[PDB]
Amino acid sequence: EPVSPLKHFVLAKKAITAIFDQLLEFVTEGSHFVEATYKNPELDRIATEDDLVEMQGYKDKLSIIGEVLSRRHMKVAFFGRTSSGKSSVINAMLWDKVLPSGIGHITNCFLSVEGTDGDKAYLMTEGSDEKKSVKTVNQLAHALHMDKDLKAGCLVRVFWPKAKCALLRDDLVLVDSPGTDVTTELDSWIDKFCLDADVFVLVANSESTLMNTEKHFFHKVNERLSKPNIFILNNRWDASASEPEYMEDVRRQHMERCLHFLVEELKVVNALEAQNRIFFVSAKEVLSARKQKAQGMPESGVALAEGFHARLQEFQNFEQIFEECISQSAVKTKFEQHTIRAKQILATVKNIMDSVNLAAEDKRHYSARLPKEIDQLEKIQNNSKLLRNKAVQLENELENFTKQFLP
Amino acid sequence: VSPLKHFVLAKKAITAIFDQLLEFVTEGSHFVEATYKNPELDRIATEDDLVEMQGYKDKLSIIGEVLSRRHMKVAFFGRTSSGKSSVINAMLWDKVLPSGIGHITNCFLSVEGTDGDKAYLMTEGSDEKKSVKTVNQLAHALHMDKDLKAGCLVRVFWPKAKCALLRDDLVLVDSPGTDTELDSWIDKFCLDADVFVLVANSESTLMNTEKHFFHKVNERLSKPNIFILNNRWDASASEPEYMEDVRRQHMERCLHFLVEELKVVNALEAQNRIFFVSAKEVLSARKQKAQGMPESGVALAEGFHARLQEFQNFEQIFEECISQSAVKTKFEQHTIRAKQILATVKNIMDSVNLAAEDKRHYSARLPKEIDQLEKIQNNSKLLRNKAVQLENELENFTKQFLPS
Ligand SMILES: Nc1nc2c(ncn2[C@@H]2O[C@H](COP(=O)(O)OP(=O)(O)O)[C@@H](O)[C@H]2O)c(=O)[nH]1
Ligand SMILES: Nc1nc2c(ncn2[C@@H]2O[C@H](COP(=O)(O)OP(=O)(O)O)[C@@H](O)[C@H]2O)c(=O)[nH]1
Numbered sequence A: 001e002p003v004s005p006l007k008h009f010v011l012a013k014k015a016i017t018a019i020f021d022q023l024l025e026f027v028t029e030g031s032h033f034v035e036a037t038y039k040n041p042e043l044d045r046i047a048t049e050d051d052l053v054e055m056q057g058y059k060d061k062l063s064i065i066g067e068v069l070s071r072r073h074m075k076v077a078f079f080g081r082t083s084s085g086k087s088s089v090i091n092a093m094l095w096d097k098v099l100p101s102g103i104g105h106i107t108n109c110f111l112s113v114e115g116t117d118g119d120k121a122y123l124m125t126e127g128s129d130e131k132k133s134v135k136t137v138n139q140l141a142h143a144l145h146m147d148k149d150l151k152a153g154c155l156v157r158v159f160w161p162k163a164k165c166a167l168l169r170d171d172l173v174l175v176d177s178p179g180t181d182v183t184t185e186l187d188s189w190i191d192k193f194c195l196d197a198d199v200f201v202l203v204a205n206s207e208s209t210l211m212n213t214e215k216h217f218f219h220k221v222n223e224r225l226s227k228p229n230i231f232i233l234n235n236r237w238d239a240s241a242s243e244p245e246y247m248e249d250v251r252r253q254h255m256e257r258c259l260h261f262l263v264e265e266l267k268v269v270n271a272l273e274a275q276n277r278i279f280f281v282s283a284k285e286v287l288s289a290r291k292q293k294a295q296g297m298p299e300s301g302v303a304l305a306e307g308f309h310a311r312l313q314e315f316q317n318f319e320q321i322f323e324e325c326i327s328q329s330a331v332k333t334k335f336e337q338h339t340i341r342a343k344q345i346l347a348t349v350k351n352i353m354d355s356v357n358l359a360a361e362d363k364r365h366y367s368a369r370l371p372k373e374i375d376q377l378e379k380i381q382n383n384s385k386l387l388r389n390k391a392v393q394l395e396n397e398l399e400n401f402t403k404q405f406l407p
Numbered sequence B: 001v002s003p004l005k006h007f008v009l010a011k012k013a014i015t016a017i018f019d020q021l022l023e024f025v026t027e028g029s030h031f032v033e034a035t036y037k038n039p040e041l042d043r044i045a046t047e048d049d050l051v052e053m054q055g056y057k058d059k060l061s062i063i064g065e066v067l068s069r070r071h072m073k074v075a076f077f078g079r080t081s082s083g084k085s086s087v088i089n090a091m092l093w094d095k096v097l098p099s100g101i102g103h104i105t106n107c108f109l110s111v112e113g114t115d116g117d118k119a120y121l122m123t124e125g126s127d128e129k130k131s132v133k134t135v136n137q138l139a140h141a142l143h144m145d146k147d148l149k150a151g152c153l154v155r156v157f158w159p160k161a162k163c164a165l166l167r168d169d170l171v172l173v174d175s176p177g178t179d180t181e182l183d184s185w186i187d188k189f190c191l192d193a194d195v196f197v198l199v200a201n202s203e204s205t206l207m208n209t210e211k212h213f214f215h216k217v218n219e220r221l222s223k224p225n226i227f228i229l230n231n232r233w234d235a236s237a238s239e240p241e242y243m244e245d246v247r248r249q250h251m252e253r254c255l256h257f258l259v260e261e262l263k264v265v266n267a268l269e270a271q272n273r274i275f276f277v278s279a280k281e282v283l284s285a286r287k288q289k290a291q292g293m294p295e296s297g298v299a300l301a302e303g304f305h306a307r308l309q310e311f312q313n314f315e316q317i318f319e320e321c322i323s324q325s326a327v328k329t330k331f332e333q334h335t336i337r338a339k340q341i342l343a344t345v346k347n348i349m350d351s352v353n354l355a356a357e358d359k360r361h362y363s364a365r366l367p368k369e370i371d372q373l374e375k376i377q378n379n380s381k382l383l384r385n386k387a388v389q390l391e392n393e394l395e396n397f398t399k400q401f402l403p404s
Helices: A007-039 A049-069 A086-093 A137-146 A186-193 A212-224 A244-265 A283-293 A308-366 A371-405 B005-037 B047-068 B084-092 B135-144 B208-219 B240-261 B279-289 B304-362 B367-401
Strands: A074-079 A110-116 A122-124 A155-161 A172-176 A199-205 A229-235 A278-280 B072-077 B109-114 B120-122 B154-159 B170-174 B195-201 B225-231 B274-276
Touching: A007 A049, A007 A308, A007 A371, A049 A308, A074 A086, A074 A212, A074 A308, A086 A172, A086 A199, A086 A229, A086 A283, A110 A186, A137 B240, A186 A212, A199 A212, A199 A308, A212 A244, A229 A244, A229 A308, A244 A278, A244 B135, A278 A308, A283 A308, A308 A371, B005 B047, B005 B304, B005 B367, B047 B304, B072 B084, B072 B208, B072 B304, B084 B109, B084 B170, B084 B195, B084 B225, B084 B279, B120 B135, B195 B208, B195 B304, B208 B240, B225 B240, B225 B304, B240 B274, B274 B304, B279 B304, B304 B367
Parallel strands: A074 A172, A074 A199, A110 A155, A199 A229, A229 A278, B072 B170, B072 B195, B109 B154, B195 B225, B225 B274
Antiparallel strands: A110 A172, A122 A155, B109 B170, B120 B154
């Protein structure tokens, strides 16, 4: 029963979409009503031109906002020097080899993974919204390899069936980035598809020490952002588990190094909470465990070194902590503004209804005679009352969404 | 048989030559001194001639006991985790160095061959022998040794009967990863070596950090021979789709580095200076064979046999190299110093044989004068002649062990 914390975001996205669809209806049901009280000739000064323009203009806005919402997702970007393991991590999070990840696999560019509803994967390049079909991680690798023309820094969106890993179902986009030791100007290309990530992951190789280039990059990032969500995965941990003599000291030296980094060098986090961003893991091992667990075979011969379970736990710990983290942050970052933008539309749509109801009441009160005419004044006054009562119900739904998902 | 024995052969050949040198020169200085101090001869042998035999006397022991300590040193460099300690160990057939002590500490580490049955540790500054039996006790004691500070090198002594290389007078040296303050530190503490090996991590591209080091070494050095070990090659072979390429590119830059950048070899000999291996596979294959077990569970990736074939071919070529180079670098000057000394000693004798003749010939007084002068001519002649026999077999050494 994996209640993956990403579902908090799937839930919120569902809720704010439901409210916005009701709202599109409410303003179109409303525009149809303001279009009719305006066109009526036996009804003057009741519906103003400054109210008909907004009631059609909101109808336009809300359609486009619905489009923007239906696209929002969670975006996590990975970074680190070449062959640290970035592609091995991602594939392990997806329980299969989605991205290529050998030695010498093309690394010159960004590769994102994200889900499609079909059973056929596919691919997209820059400048072309053609969907280039992609049949397997093998032919994806052999294709990239042959592209000598493939631009440096460019973006390649992979679309992988949501029914292969859960992570892709639950609206999460994962982004692999050019090796941070062979590019020099990666801090320039990050503005295209990575500066707006919710969570960044430094995939540090734990057979080494954190080189300045990796740290220098996150600097230039953290300079432009506001307390970004930075995780460090000292990957390849198994390497040092083959020699227990030094395991305590080796870890304590990395763990002190990463701790001092986030806490003191990046100042993005304090020590107490840093302990839930630095993990020691083995992507190659996690991916081997999973890619076998799905096929049916039991947990046999996956551990290349002793300590495999301790390591797997720490990874599952990372996935847990990270998932929770990205969904809380992204729900706020990507929805709190549309929520505020609806409270304003509602607040003015309904006071348009109040001014329509209020005029029609004062028309029947001081300027009305005909049985046929005053019977229109009552159906306009009742409809405006009914629609304004819809607005208040939507205002409550939004108060409720904000209460559940937006403290 | 091991191509190493050529160094051993020379060592014994020359070291006993220099014995006779200390023998000959002592007898000849005993005779110069007497003829000089003799008050009945005058200027048959000079004060200039006296002091020269005395210096030659006191210097020849020094050069002979320094001489006997000479050996072949091989140095390994490369950034942390590339496989240095692993390469060394594959060449000794055992895990004598531990891996994560280069990761905890930065120190040099040597393995010389002891004639004892149990290994032992020695640091700098002390003459305490910490004895070890298992590698684990070594790996532990290295860890606990608080004195293991930067640049401080520990000699590990490993029984000569446990590996031919240490038996055959070879010393191997690990070193801190070039990932630091090792710029001006290396000097004679590792630039004394005859061959430098560069252990490169195939997972990356050859980085400046390594080149930046060997280029700095190459400036204060002339024509040093260097091998590049592209280690961890199993990681490339696991991914065949990119493997031809990754190997081509590593060849290309390795080739360029030696031939063009470093100007240390030519394009045809560079071929036998670059290798694509997997140290850990070799250490496994050999630590398992050491106990007579068949080979099993050793391959890290398909092609293990080729990586093994390449490490064996590398070892042959390495031993051929450091056997020929080390005889020349460690001995030839001492040969030149020796043939210098003989030519100078044999002219000294002649100079008194002729002073003796020119007395016996142009100033004989009594039979007793004549008797004393003739003794000295035969004495000079007999010494003068043992110099020419030493000159001959000392040349006979060069023709056999310094061909040009
Ligand atoms: N032992 C071990 N090897 C790993 C681990 N993670 C990655 N690798 C290996 O590291 C090499 C580079 O990994 P890769 O996925 O390409 O990292 P990237 O180049 O930055 O994308 C590959 O040969 C993997 O097999 C790990 O946790 N343990
Ligand atoms: N897969 C693989 N691993 C290796 C190879 N050579 C060394 N290693 C591993 O690299 C890690 C660190 O290498 P090490 O031998 O300590 O090199 P050093 O740190 O520079 O002395 C060790 O855990 C080795 O097991 C190889 O050829 N293949």
